[PDB]
């Protein structure tokens, strides 16, 4: 409980302070400041991009990692009374790593796109470079979070399948279909991230 | 079996003292039916080998008896809903005859769509018309049995809901174009004057100013049918329905303390008739009489030309209780109104100590004298 409440306090306080500021700069007519335009323009497109690339990997890796130990823990625990589980049910781990694969694929593809502008004025940087930095962030975020959720789901359902096998071997083959429906979400994340990436150029 | 079970159950309420030959029992009855029970006792002896007629004496040192009221098809529900909040004290004023209209009236003010008034009327009518059938049908539809036991009261409130829906001039978002109007035809917005504003009104929304000569004047029906279609109608309707509810509530409260005085007179108690009604009615009347007068006064004293910079009713009420009229922002309604506001609240506040303390002090003096 307590360690969550400390974080929750920071979270609520953060939004409460934004509401105070949002009212303040509105009512004092200072609302010409904090125009989202300068934030989304004076930020470097390379920042957005590299966060995107790193998200694409790391969130996929988190989804896959949860994926792995969630099923693995069950493989081991059922495996004590049913050693047969380990060889076949390991395909869930393979699909969790496939969510990581989807990460590294999309990340490497994104990583080819960025190049230096030799510019610092927003007009000399120009629309293509901003649009690329944002699109790359979007793609990397899309695949990353989609894979994050995909891998956790695959780990959960694959754990279930492993504990089904522990009671009857035939259940594994039948139940395994749900790991596809899990894995597909990560592929959909890839597909969208490709399309978000598909028009980009930098420099 | 039912009759025997009930008889022997009731017989277990009797008593036998150490010297006693008979049984002994006591009953409450209506004073009208003290004869009826004596005839039943005489018959009860005659329906047996016994000769002694089992007669009674009236008891004198009585506790407060169980409370009763007679009922019929039109009054059964009204008494049950009174009893549902609680059974009255003996000889107390009965709310139920006032409730027979008052509850239906407030319901109809609430439920005042003309078409819904008809549909509820129809439902209650189909229950009354089918009464001889329905009394023999399934008891298991308890929902239908409950509303059937309300059928006559539901009908009465249905009728009043028609009447309110008529004054509100609305069935299902529809109004009676059978009527004339205080609104005026488009040519009247174009008398050389206002025609320029009607050319703007030939591209965008416009408000009728209700100016004389253009306006169709005072109106003899309920609400003007045009307020069904007008975009500002809800503002007009709200100004009305608030002010209505206030006056109606005030009147029912003043009737409640009048019923209190009548109850105090029925018990014939000099303290209750004095220290109850007098301070309560004066407190309420001094606030509410002025408020209702102001509500009706504005509709007489103000009109279209005065509308721009017209005062607020609620402010002239608030600044009575608070005195706090800031010599500004609202026009005063009549000469000496500031003095009237001060006087009325002072007169009401001067009533409170009599209820708060002087009645208690007389009760304390009575307990000290009863020694």
């Amino acid at each position: 409980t307590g360690l969550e409440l400390l974080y929750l306090g920071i979270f609520v306080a953060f939004w409460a302070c934004m509401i105070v500021v949002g009212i303040c700069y509105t009512i004092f007519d200072l609302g010409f400041r904090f125009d989202v335009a300068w934030f989304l323009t004076e930020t470097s497109p390379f920042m957005w991009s590299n966060l995107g690339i790193g998200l694409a990997i790391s969130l996929s890796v988190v989804g896959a990692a949860w994926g792995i130990y969630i099923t693995g823990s069950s493989i081991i625990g059922g495996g004590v009374k049913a050693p047969r589980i380990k060889t076949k049910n390991l395909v869930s781990i393979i699909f969790c790593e496939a969510v990581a694969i989807y990460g590294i694929i999309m990340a490497i593809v994104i990583s080819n796109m960025a190049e230096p502008f030799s510019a610092t004025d927003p007009k000399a940087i120009g629309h293509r470079n901003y649009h690329a930095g944002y699109s790359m962030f979007g793609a990397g975020l899309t695949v990353g979070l989609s894979n994050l959720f995909c891998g956790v789901c695959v780990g959960i359902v694959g754990s279930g399948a492993a504990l089904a096998d522990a009671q009857n071997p035939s259940l594994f083959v039948k139940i395994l279909i749900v790991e596809i429906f899990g894995s597909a979400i990560g592929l959909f994340g890839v597909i969208v991230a490709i399309l978000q990436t598909s028009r980009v150029k930098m420099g | 079996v039912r009759k025997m079970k009930a008889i022997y159950h009731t017989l277990n309420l009797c008593n036998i003292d150490v010297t006693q030959k008979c049984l002994i029992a006591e009953v409450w009855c209506p004073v009208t039916d003290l004869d009826s029970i004596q005839f039943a006792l005489r018959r009860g002896t005659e329906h047996s080998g016994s000769t002694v007629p089992s007669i009674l004496n009236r008891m004198q040192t009585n506790q407060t008896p169980p409370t009763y009221n007679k009922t019929n098809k039109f009054t059964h529900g009204f008494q049950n809903i009174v009893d549902a909040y609680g059974i009255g004290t003996y000889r107390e004023i009965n709310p139920a005859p006032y409730t027979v209209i008052t509850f239906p009236f407030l319901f109809a003010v609430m439920f005042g769509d003309f078409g819904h008034g008809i549909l509820m009327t129809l439902f209650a009518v189909w229950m009354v018309l089918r009464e001889s059938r329905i009394l023999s049908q399934k008891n298991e539809n308890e929902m239908f049995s409950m509303v059937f036991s309300g059928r006559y009261i539901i009908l009465l409130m249905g009728l009043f809901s028609i009447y309110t829906g008529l004054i509100y001039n609305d069935c299902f978002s529809k109004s009676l174009n059978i009527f004339g109007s205080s609104w005026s035809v488009r040519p009247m917005f174009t008398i050389g004057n206002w025609t320029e504003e009607t050319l703007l009104g030939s591209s965008v929304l416009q408000l009728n100013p209700a100016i004389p000569g253009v306006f169709g004047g005072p109106y003899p029906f309920g609400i003007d049918p045009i307020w069904n279609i007008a975009t500002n109608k809800l503002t007009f309707l709200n100004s009305f329905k608030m002010k209505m509810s206030v006056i109606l509530g005030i009147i029912h409260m003043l009737f409640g303390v009048s019923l209190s005085l009548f109850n105090h007179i029925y018990f014939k108690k000099p303290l209750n008739i004095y220290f109850g009604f007098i301070p309560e009615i004066i407190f309420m009347s001094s606030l509410f009489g002025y408020l209702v007068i102001l509500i009706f006064y504005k509709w007489t004293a103000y009109d279209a030309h005065s509308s721009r910079n017209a005062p607020s009713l609620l402010i002239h009420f608030i600044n009575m209780f608070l005195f706090s009229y800031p010599e500004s922002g609202n026009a005063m309604l009549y000469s000496g109104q500031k003095g009237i506001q001060c006087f009325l609240i002072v007169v009401a506040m001067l009533c409170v100590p009599w209820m708060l303390l002087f009645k208690p002090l007389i009760l304390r003096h009575q307990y000290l004298r009863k020694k």
């Binding site: - | 039109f74 209209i101 008052t102 609104w183 009104g201 416009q206 009728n208 002010k243 006056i247 017209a310």
Partner: protein, 77 residues
């Protein structure tokens, strides 16, 4: 004149019900309830209508209409 006549009509209608009721009503326990029904009906129904008509007198603002309605109310009434 023309506003006061409707008031007199509705005032007289509810008042005359309260007046005539006791003459029309019979003896016995139903009497006082039936008469009280007429009396309270006249009071409440008169007052509710009286407020509505008095509130309809001297309108401080007139109806607001849309452009489309303003054109059509020229011919359809």
């Amino acid at each position: 004149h023309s506003f006061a006549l409707p008031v007199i009509i509705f005032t007289t209608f509810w008042g005359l019900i309260g007046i005539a009721g006791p003459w029309f009503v019979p003896k016995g326990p139903n009497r006082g309830v039936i008469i009280t029904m007429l009396v309270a009906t006249a009071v409440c129904c008169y007052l509710f209508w009286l407020i509505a008509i008095l509130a309809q007198l001297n309108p401080l603002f007139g109806p607001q209409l849309k452009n489309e309605t303003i054109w059509y109310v020229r011919f359809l009434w």
